[PDB]
Enzyme design. Structure first.
Site, PDB file in Angstrom:
ATOM      1  N   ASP A 190      -2.663  -8.001  -6.905  1.00  0.00           N
ATOM      2  CA  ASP A 190      -2.910  -8.373  -5.522  1.00  0.00           C
ATOM      3  C   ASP A 190      -1.764  -9.144  -4.872  1.00  0.00           C
ATOM      4  O   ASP A 190      -1.082  -9.938  -5.525  1.00  0.00           O
ATOM      5  CB  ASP A 190      -4.189  -9.218  -5.468  1.00  0.00           C
ATOM      6  CG  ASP A 190      -4.517  -9.702  -4.070  1.00  0.00           C
ATOM      7  OD1 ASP A 190      -4.993  -8.883  -3.259  1.00  0.00           O
ATOM      8  OD2 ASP A 190      -4.306 -10.901  -3.784  1.00  0.00           O
ATOM      9  N   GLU A 216      -0.234  -3.809  -4.997  1.00  0.00           N
ATOM     10  CA  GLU A 216      -0.301  -3.584  -3.571  1.00  0.00           C
ATOM     11  C   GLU A 216       0.749  -4.403  -2.851  1.00  0.00           C
ATOM     12  O   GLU A 216       0.643  -5.631  -2.751  1.00  0.00           O
ATOM     13  CB  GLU A 216      -1.651  -3.957  -2.984  1.00  0.00           C
ATOM     14  CG  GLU A 216      -1.628  -3.814  -1.468  1.00  0.00           C
ATOM     15  CD  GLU A 216      -2.913  -4.216  -0.803  1.00  0.00           C
ATOM     16  OE1 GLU A 216      -3.872  -3.416  -0.846  1.00  0.00           O
ATOM     17  OE2 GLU A 216      -2.960  -5.329  -0.234  1.00  0.00           O
TER      18      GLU A 216
END
Ligand SMILES: [Ca+2]
Ligand SMILES: [Ca+2]
Length: 415
Positions: A190, A216
């Protein structure tokens, strides 16, 4: 299933994964402390639907709150205790063992960038002054400082110095822990813009070197300094560079950006459409997630960058038939009625043997998106919102219809 790194040592685990995002944004609110029970109960179905992996919510407890409203989803956890809002520790172990048992590897969403520093009762209490925090160092703005080699989360006051030996170590030990006792088959990183991509490669090397991972990196070129090459590079170049250093596949935000801002024909500019297999094979494609998309319940989720409703079928037909590694959003699959359609597309993908590195060619002589995907088993011709008449117009060989929905707006032919 098949394991293995890419020719560039990137951790795409065989390149044959078909992933299900195992949650939506409002789960902690819509199914209070029952999500793990639900997933265990759904393991069989999830495996039957054709998924090889499942992206689980952040396992670290989050009791944060704010007021739209939110909190507890896991992106502002206060420690590694598994008794959070998704279920108990025991429940997590049972769900993971059930999923792994059904042939679905468990990928954990991990948030290394920050933590709920101000939470009163937590097992992780790092004091100020020792360099454990980004704000232990002068923090002029949203860019790396002496206590954080990445961007910061909002104000940055909860940003951890993931580069500090102790902080790096505690994360490393927990990833090992997740792999060791919570059946983790990989991780989803993340807010990767918040710390060095090289650190992600270090964590994987340390705790799950041969597992699957995806990071991400959500950051447009305009978010980089005008002296940084990324400032004038494409979304593709930017996420590919991160994958290069982290040796981990990366979410295709280049494709998502074209899905949101360009024409369907322009989707070919996503990372997954790159003519260089070393480039498209590291792309992890998706339509929407708990952040960009809607979610059942409260305010309809976050929907920060949601796909136009009338393109959902087209989007799924595209990512499920093209290179890169596809991800299906929980809600589309199990709440909004696209399950049957997606089920069919997954079977088409497996029958043709499409892989993350399968070749893809685009045809601009017709309207919409027309492509030829060279799967290991069969060759597919894909026509979305196109005036293409027949696959023989763009490809040689004996073709049969594999998909024909939305009044021909979604057409797939296989050899
Ligand atoms: Ca695999
Ligand atoms: Ca940071």
């Amino acid at each position: 299933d098949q394991a293995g790194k890419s020719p560039n040592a990137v951790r795409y685990h065989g390149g044959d994964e078909i992933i299900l995002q195992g949650f939506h944004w409002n789960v902690v609110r819509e199914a209070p402390n029952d999500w793990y029970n639900i997933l265990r109960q759904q393991a069989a179905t999830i495996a039957a639907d054709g998924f090889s992996a499942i992206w689980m919510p952040v396992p670290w407890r989050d009791f944060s709150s704010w007021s739209k409203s939110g909190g507890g989803e896991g992106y502002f956890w206060h420690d590694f205790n598994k008794n959070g809002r998704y279920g108990s520790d025991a429940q997590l172990r049972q769900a993971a063992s059930a999923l792994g048992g059904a042939g679905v590897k468990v990928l954990y969403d991990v948030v290394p960038n920050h933590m709920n520093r101000g939470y009163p009762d937590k097992e992780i209490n790092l004091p100020a002054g020792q360099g454990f925090w980004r704000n232990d160092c002068a923090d002029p703005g949203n860019y790396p400082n002496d206590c954080d080699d990445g961007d910061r989360f909002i104000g940055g006051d909860a940003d951890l110095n993931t580069g500090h030996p102790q902080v790096y170590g505690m994360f490393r030990d927990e990833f090992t822990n997740l792999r060791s006792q919570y059946g983790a088959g990989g991780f989803r990183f993340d807010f990767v813009r918040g710390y060095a991509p090289e650190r992600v490669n270090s964590w994987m090397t340390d705790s799950a070197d041969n597992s699957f991972c995806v990071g991400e990196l959500w950051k447009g070129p305009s978010e980089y300094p005008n002296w940084d090459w990324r400032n004038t590079a494409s979304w593709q170049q930017i996420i590919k560079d991160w994958s290069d250093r982290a040796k981990c596949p990366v979410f295709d935000f280049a494709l998502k950006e074209r899905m949101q801002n360009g024409s369907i024909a322009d989707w070919k500019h996503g990372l997954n459409g790159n003519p260089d297999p070393r480039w498209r094979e590291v792309a992890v494609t998706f339509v929407d997630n708990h952040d960009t998309g809607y979610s059942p319940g409260q305010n309809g989720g976050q929907h920060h960058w949601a796909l136009q409703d009338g393109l959902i079928r087209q989007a799924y037909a595209y990512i499920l038939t093209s290179p890169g590694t596809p991800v299906v959003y929980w809600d589309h699959m199990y709440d909004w009625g696209y399950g049957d359609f997606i089920r069919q597309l997954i079977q088409v993908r497996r029958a043709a043997g499409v892989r993350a590195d399968s070749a893809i060619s685009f045809h601009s002589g017709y309207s919409g998106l027309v492509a030829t995907v060279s799967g290991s088993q069969q060759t597919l011709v894909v026509a979305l919102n196109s005036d293409l008449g027949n696959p023989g117009q763009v490809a040689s060989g004996s073709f049969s219809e594999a998909v024909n929905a939305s009044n021909g707006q979604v057409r797939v032919w296989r050899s």
